[PDB]
Design a protein around this ligand. Structure first.
Ligand SMILES: NC(=O)C1=CN([C@@H]2O[C@H](COP(=O)(O)OP(=O)(O)OC[C@H]3O[C@@H](n4cnc5c(N)ncnc54)[C@@H](OP(=O)(O)O)[C@@H]3O)[C@@H](O)[C@H]2O)C=CC1
Ligand SMILES: COc1ccc(OCCCCCC(=O)O)cc1Cc1cnc2nc(N)nc(N)c2c1C
Length: 206
């Protein structure tokens, strides 16, 4: 009991794979955040009685989210950290690795329990993404591609959209994205505050 679910990674990144600048996001993208929330939150209606999605995040990502938005509402939050928090203890799930998080969620949210887990998301940390790209249950990347070389100091660790990884990672038809995300989603370039981005969904075979 531990191999059940695929992991999905969700990320926004520039075409040079930049994702972060001063333990923050190098952009301010109200719509993009709104997609993140909607993807990360969606549970099919029949399952929305009992089921919640899970968001897994590195410790530096936890801190870098404005305090008023923590925990991410309507999703089971787990922060990955070797400490043995200390979190500020406080009823926010904690684990020292991606697999220790999964084990905790299965123990905590089992057949028995009131709440049921629907999908599991890795929402970041470059360090946590690195561990997720190595994990053999990671089969899906919901990527927002930012068409600008915004200066970054933290990078996505694997060039999954580049030719050297193109036999492993495959970009899906937009209708397959909408279908996976349960909603109609903007297709093509979107422009908030000065640059174009778009929503992509990438997969690999387990
Ligand atoms: N553009 C986007 O889509 C997103 C960008 N970001 C950005 O990425 C940056 C943060 O990335 P990064 O600095 O790497 O930090 P992370 O958010 O991955 O947090 C790093 C810390 O998380 C714990 N951790 C992460 N991975 C593991 C692991 N495999 N095993 C055990 N513990 C782990 C910490 O442990 P310990 O307690 O020991 O410190 C480690 O120091 C920020 O700028 C943030 O804004 C974040 C989310 C999304
Ligand atoms: C540094 O990470 C930040 C910094 C500030 C921030 O502003 C608060 C918004 C919270 C309200 C929405 C909700 O309730 O969900 C959010 C995040 C997380 C984030 C943002 N975009 C994201 N966009 C994508 N494509 N992927 C991610 N993984 C994102 C992730 C983790």
């Amino acid at each position: 009991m531990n191999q059940q679910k695929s992991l999905t990674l969700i990320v926004a990144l520039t075409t040079s794979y930049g994702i972060g600048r001063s333990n923050s996001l190098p952009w301010k993208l109200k719509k993009e955040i709104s997609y993140f929330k909607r993807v990360t939150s969606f549970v099919p209606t029949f399952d929305s009685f009992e089921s919640m999605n899970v968001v897994l995040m590195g410790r530096k990502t936890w801190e870098s989210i404005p305090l008023q938005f923590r925990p991410l509402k309507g999703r089971i939050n787990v922060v990955i950290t070797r400490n043995e928090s200390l979190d500020l203890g406080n009823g926010i799930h904690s684990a020292k690795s991606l697999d220790h998080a999964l084990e905790l969620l299965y123990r905590t949210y089992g057949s028995e329990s009131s709440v049921q887990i629907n999908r599991i998301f890795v929402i970041g940390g470059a360090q946590l993404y690195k561990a997720a790209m190595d994990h053999p249950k990671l089969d899906r990347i919901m990527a927002t591609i930012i068409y600008k070389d915004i200066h970054c100091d933290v990078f996505f660790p694997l060039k999954f959209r580049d030719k050297e990884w193109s036999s492993v990672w495959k970009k899906e038809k937009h209708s397959d994205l909408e279908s996976w995300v349960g909603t109609k989603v903007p297709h093509g370039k979107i422009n908030e505050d000065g640059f174009d981005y778009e929503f992509e969904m990438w997969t690999r075979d387990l």
